[PDB]
Structure 1
């Protein structure tokens, strides 16, 4: 695998977004991964609608601003035959009624999704070498919350509670890291991103390797 990967460098990552006062992170992670594979497979970068997932993608386990799962996000886009753009179905940071007309407008599609084998940073690295990958991690701790620069090495728990998107990886000063795209706006971390320690084993740093998944498009 490559020594360094950064999906931002090849125009596969939309500018940093802010979920605001709403636990919709599963939706931001779903969308960032779909945005990535769409650029990789088709050549065009399009900013897509988190609000559509929040309003229209509710399940037994996925509950808009009350948390959810990227697998349900991917499932919705597959089931619906696509997803609308950010511009057409804008983000409100509030749970609203599913706009059926906007739901019918489809600008990006995915064919399938896959789960990265659990607790396997090597499998995760393999997946990230091909595309941005949706992950969940433990983001509730003071140090994670106040992260501003460098490679985050903890402390943090492992009990997944917040979804982000891995958009690359690398090594600096002998320390391996993942590049994480968060949805807390540009004022958090390294202009919205975090470098977080990689190759620590097991569940990965802050549990990052526990529940990784990515969307699939059959044709390039």
Structure 2
């Protein structure tokens, strides 16, 4: 447990006999549904931390089941907030095994929940507690932006490490173009700048220290993507936390955490 994930080093993929290592990488195909994959994986690791099985949430159900006017669910993404909204509106969260994802089905009619389907949100509550002395908490999610921590990156890193330890992951936003380089197919720690904006949700799932090719002591995030297990390094990659000095923007644009109440299993 602690030997695989502590303040200095965290890689739960190395503990083959634990829940999070059994959440296999998924392939979103050719729709812009990373918001669903990253959000549901964050809930999957939270469920692992609470003693539940590594049961995959149905990304397709979340894509296809929404209230109100028709949305463009393949060509355009959404946000983690909308993932939460779908959970609260429908109250039921089916398993991938019951309604399996194929990108060509993204946008089809929301399916009837069958009698034998598993609810992976049973006994689950999104928290909207008003605890702080201001009116801004209680959204069900909390977001932090690297640009707002420009002069306090140590705090940004600490917040993320704490959540990865406690919840098993955070949701992170990046610009997809930034991981498109030929070089992202290696096992090297990538080192690059982010952009002013982001458009693709991934998960930070771990971290560690390393020495870069210039002989400098540095640290990296371990990042999970949803482009299948043959992308990057078995579906994941490593990226320098602080990145190059000259960067206006960090590679990690922002992170999102879900605030939920879930009974231990």
TM-score range, shorter chain: 0.7 to 0.9
1:50-104, CA deviations, whole angstroms, 9 ceiling, x for partnerless residues? 00111014778x7422111122112222332231111101102032111132599
- The question of 1:99 aligning with 2:143 is answered no
- Counterpart CA distance in 2 for 1:151 and 1:54 is 33
**Distance in 2, Cα, partners of 1:133 & 1:115:** 10
Name the TM-score, length of structure 2 as normaliser. 0.72
Q: In structure 1, what is the Cα distance between the partners aligned to 2:117 and 2:79?
A: 23
User: After superposition, where does 1:136-155 map in structure 2 within 5 Å?
Assistant: 136-141=173-178, 143-144=180-181, 146-149=183-186, 150-155=188-193
Instruction: Choose 1 or 2 for highest CA Rg.
Output: 2
TM-score, structure 1 normalization? 0.86
Q: Distance in 2 between matches of 1:203 and 1:80?
A: 41
**Gapped runs of 5+ residues in structure 2?**
1-5, 127-139, 147-155, 212-216
Whole-angstrom CA distance in 1 between matches of 2:196 and 2:160:
16
**CA deviation string 1:128-174 (max 9, x = no partner):** 12121111111214655650221111244241111111111111223
Unpaired runs of 5+ residues, structure 1, are none
- Distance change >3 Å, CA 4–CA 103, structure 1 → 2: farther
Distance 1:33 1:215 in 2: 11
Q: How many residues align?
A: 219
Q: Distance in 1 between matches of 2:8 and 2:205?
A: 14
Aligned counterpart for 1:39 among listed residues 36, 48, 60: 48
Find the aligned partners of 1:34 and 1:130 in 2 and give their Cα distance.
12
